[PDB]
Amino acid sequence: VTPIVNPSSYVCNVCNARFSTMSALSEHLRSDHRDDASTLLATPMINNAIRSFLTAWDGIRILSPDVSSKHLSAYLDSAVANGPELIVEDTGLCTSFMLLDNIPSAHLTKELIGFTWFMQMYQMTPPLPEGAVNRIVCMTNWASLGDEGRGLEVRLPPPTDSSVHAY
């Protein structure tokens, strides 16, 4: 039967090391498992080559100017017979920034009762974030509506995360 609950921890095959996150396990496999100089060709230098290749992998980029270089393309008569997609119309909210709930407010039930009031208690969606700490972030077309859109967007996580990948 298909699983429905994520693993509580992740396991490497031989090191018996258990990890709370698969990312941590991934790094352990990425680094610690891969020195192992024991064969006729398991040299340290190739281990570095493999290690570099592992770190350098990214196969889900929209733009890839590195590999697009030297893509000499010949002019074709039929190719230019498409026309650009000019008509794109949106019925959603003309906005590109989102208010966030970066730190949720605590649910007090024994002491400090009444200091907090969630609109959910009245079955209402609040018009503003009601977290302990609220941030403004850039998430293009977060309220878009009507059709698919251009297909490339900018989405930044709250500053509690790295957000490095955007740059």
């Binding site: 393309s73 010949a74 002019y75 008569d77 000019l86």
Partner: protein, 148 residues
């Protein structure tokens, strides 16, 4: 269409139309130059242009090429049958219809539209050999055709 196919529009309210279908010459000039940059400047670039235009030309034209009247007017010339050379045969051996319906003619016309990119030249083989004399009849006929 050079004012052919004249047409007009009705006269009534058209509230919310939008037809973004146009651009300035500078845009066209820029695109044309860009188009010229993305090609191999050898014959490979020119050939599709000339070929396409030539096909369009042959597609729509009232002119019809037919050599029957010319030959009919040529073969009716009387000459002695006791001679060893009949220049009529020499002529008709030339002007050989290769069955391509004279692609060269339309090819030459199309080349004019893109003369700034490609030039049509007379084939080297279609020349009289420099070793010949004017009295060598095939050479003389060749020179005549080149002149024409």
């Amino acid at each position: 269409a050079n004012n052919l196919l004249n047409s007009t529009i009705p006269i009534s309210l058209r509230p919310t139309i939008l037809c973004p279908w146009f651009a300035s010459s500078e845009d066209l000039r820029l695109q044309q130059v860009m188009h010229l940059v993305n090609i191999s400047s050898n014959t490979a670039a020119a050939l599709p242009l000339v070929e396409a235009l030539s096909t369009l030309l042959r597609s729509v034209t009232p002119l019809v090429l037919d050599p029957t009247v010319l030959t009919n007017a040529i073969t009716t010339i009387s000459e002695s049958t006791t001679q060893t050379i009949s220049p009529i045969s020499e002529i008709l051996r030339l002007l050989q219809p290769m069955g391509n319906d004279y692609a060269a003619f339309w090819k030459c016309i199309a080349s004019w539209a893109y003369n700034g990119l490609v030039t049509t030249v007379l084939s080297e083989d279609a020349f009289p050999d420099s070793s010949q004399s004017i009295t060598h009849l095939p050479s003389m006929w060749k020179c005549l055709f080149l002149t024409l």
